Structure formats: structure tokens, C-alpha cells
Amino acid sequence: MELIGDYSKAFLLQTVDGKHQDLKYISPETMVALLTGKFSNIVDKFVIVDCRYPYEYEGGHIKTAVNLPLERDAESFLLKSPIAPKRVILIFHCEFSSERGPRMCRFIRERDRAVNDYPSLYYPEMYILKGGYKEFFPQHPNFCEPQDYRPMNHEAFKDELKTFRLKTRSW
Ligand SMILES: [Cl-]
Prior knowledge:
It is classed as hydrolase, cell cycle. Keywords: sulfenic Cysteine, hydrolase, cell cycle. Helix content is 29%, strand content 16%. It is α/β, with parallel strands linked by helices. The protein has one domain (1-171): Rhodanese-like domain (Oxidized Rhodanese, domain 1). Helix 4 (100-114) links the parallel strand 5 and strand 6 (126-129). The N and C termini lie far apart (35 Å).
């Protein structure tokens, strides 16, 4: 397997097959391994980036996840003052096997390459959570807050979906 983004070392986590062949995917069990400190002697900090809209996040998210659905906010949070360490790892996710998580992962890599001298990176190791929140919640509800799941297409949130789409950079 290839080295991480800055070619400094191998990827730390066991991976699973996902839709995008160019990206690295992890399972809910691996996400729990990170949250439970199984990799604490090697991983200084990891950030779970929930790419879903605010109403989805508010309805139930993974504990400690940061909601950064807009490219400009993810860029500001992650790259204005980079989270330095040991390894730093980013895990991106959305509701299921959609495109919000993968798009944000690729965007952050593009910006990280842009602000660095090749091949150095602030976030050389990034993964996508396979199956997103939809598959994580039924496996580990006690690692979620609140213990619920609100889909993007929830009947009572049609206006909220629309309101938030009008804040994105492109459609
Ligand atoms: Cl955006």
C-alpha cells in the first residue's frame, strides 16, 4: 500500500473497500478504535469532519465530530491555524455513500497542497467513514450525541435543506 500524502510513513488504519477507488475508507469498528484510544501512543489528534447539513448533525452525530459542511468553513477550521501534533488524522463522513464526504476530502487535499511546498502537508492522512452516519449509528449508538438519526431527506426538514443549499459555493 502507498504511503500517506507527504510520503513520510504508511497509513496507520486498516482499510475497507468504498465507492471511490482513489480514497481510503474505514469501518465503524476502526472509528471506535480511534475514539477508544487504541492508537493513542501514535495518534496525537484526529478530527471527525461531519459533512452533513446542520439539521442532520443536530439530530445525531458522532461524539466529538465537528460539523463543517461548507468548503470555506472546513478550510478555515482546518487550515487557517493547522492542528499540529505523532500523527494527525482526518476522518470525513456524510449520511451514507454519497458525495459530500468524498468532495470535502478532495477539497481539503487540494488546499493543503496549495499552501505547502511539495510534498509536505498539514493533513497527510485522511479517511472516509464507510457507510457514514447511517451505518455508524446502528452499530455504536452510545458513541453518538444525541442518540438519534435525522436523514437529509427527513419530511419535516425540506425547507432547511433548501435554505442551506443556498449557502454553498456551487450546485
Ligand atoms: Cl460550499
